[PDB]
């Protein structure tokens, strides 16, 4: 069969690219002393989440290659936990980055206390703790469902629980973060468009204007990659659609589209930044 083979090749390509990129990013941020700023903490935590997902993906590539799941239940639990961490922590980190950019650009005078290297680590720990509290149910109910075949899935105690899960994820994963991000940037734009000099010198103004644009482009790429998945899920929940053979290709396409985003992020930092490019060159060459 061709579909399984091409989707396995794509999974392995994605895994290799993402592992290389995120390992390079983590190493560069931890090794050098010029690269220790307030935004690189959030970038580092995003990279750690993507690295965990990249360590988990080969088992899903295997399961899609041969339809059986031969690895047991203890591995199923861990792969479901990592998939939840990938879905939730990445958006929570992007939300905190956007709030940080708002504080840095619009309120530079008052917010000088909330931007200190001791206060960012507490916010990162709170991000992880809230993410784990949100993940807890899929961690509890993950298991194996027998079709001779076995599959790693979530066995809801039911259906109504599936329709509840779709809404629970659509509301805590897409809507509430995007509203906050949209408000932050709607306010940031007016301020930039009106002011002449942001911080009193041309160098600080220039750096602020570069970093804000990089962050906005990262968020736009995220939205682009994760929109069709939610459109499809909510469309299937709302109206009754009887499954057809055409309903599998669309689902596989949108899922692998979501998976591609983790690979995409370590490539932007090379074009849209200069310190990251200098460091990547100094390390690799």
């Amino acid at each position, epitope marked *: 069969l061709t579909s399984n083979a091409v989707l396995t090749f794509i999974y392995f390509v994605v895994c290799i690219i993402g592992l290389c990129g995120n390992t390079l990013v983590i190493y560069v941020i931890l090794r050098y002393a010029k690269m220790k700023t307030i935004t690189n903490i959030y970038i580092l935590n995003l990279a750690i989440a993507d690295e965990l997902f990249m360590l988990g993906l080969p088992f899903l590539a295997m399961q899609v290659a041969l339809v059986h799941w031969p690895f047991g239940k203890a591995i199923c639990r861990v792969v479901m936990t990592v998939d939840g961490i990938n879905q939730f922590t990445s958006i929570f980190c992007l939300t905190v980055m956007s709030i940080d950019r708002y504080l840095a650009v619009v309120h530079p005078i008052k917010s000088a206390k909330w931007r200190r290297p001791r206060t960012a680590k507490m916010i990162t720990m709170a991000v992880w703790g809230v993410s784990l509290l949100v993940i807890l149910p899929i961690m509890i109910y993950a298991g194996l469902r027998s079709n001779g075949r076995s599959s790693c899935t979530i066995n809801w105690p039911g259906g109504a629980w599936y329709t509840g899960f779709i809404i629970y994820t659509f509301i805590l994963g897409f809507l509430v973060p995007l509203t906050i991000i949209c408000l932050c940037y709607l306010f940031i*734009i007016i301020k*930039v468009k009106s002011v*002449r000099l942001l911080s009193g010198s*041309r160098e600080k103004d*220039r750096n602020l*204007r*570069r970093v*804000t*644009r990089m962050v906005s482009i990262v968020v736009a790429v995220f939205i682009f990659c994760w929109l069709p998945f939610y459109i499809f899920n909510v469309s299937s929940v709302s109206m009754a659609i009887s499954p057809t053979p055409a309903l599998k290709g669309m689902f596989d396409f949108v899922v692998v589209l979501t998976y591609a985003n983790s690979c995409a992020n370590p490539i932007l930092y090379a074009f849209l930044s200069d310190n990251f490019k200098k460091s990547f060159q100094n390390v690799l060459c």
Partner: nanobody
Amino acid sequence: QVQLQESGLRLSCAASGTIFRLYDMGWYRLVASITSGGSTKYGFTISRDNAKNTVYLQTAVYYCNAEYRTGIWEELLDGWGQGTQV
């Protein structure tokens, strides 16, 4: 990127090109300057029309100077002009 043309008492300076916004303009021998909000500062009379990006002022050489950005996420630059004989 920007282009500044001077004319000719009455002196006039006009700007054209690929511009996003125009900040304070001035005439140098500092002889005149006008902030983007009419807040003039001498040290004649100087006026500014922001509909066409033009600055008017009413012996030696006199140059024109402007400040500009080419985008919203870019750096502040300033452009000079040619000379004129009074």
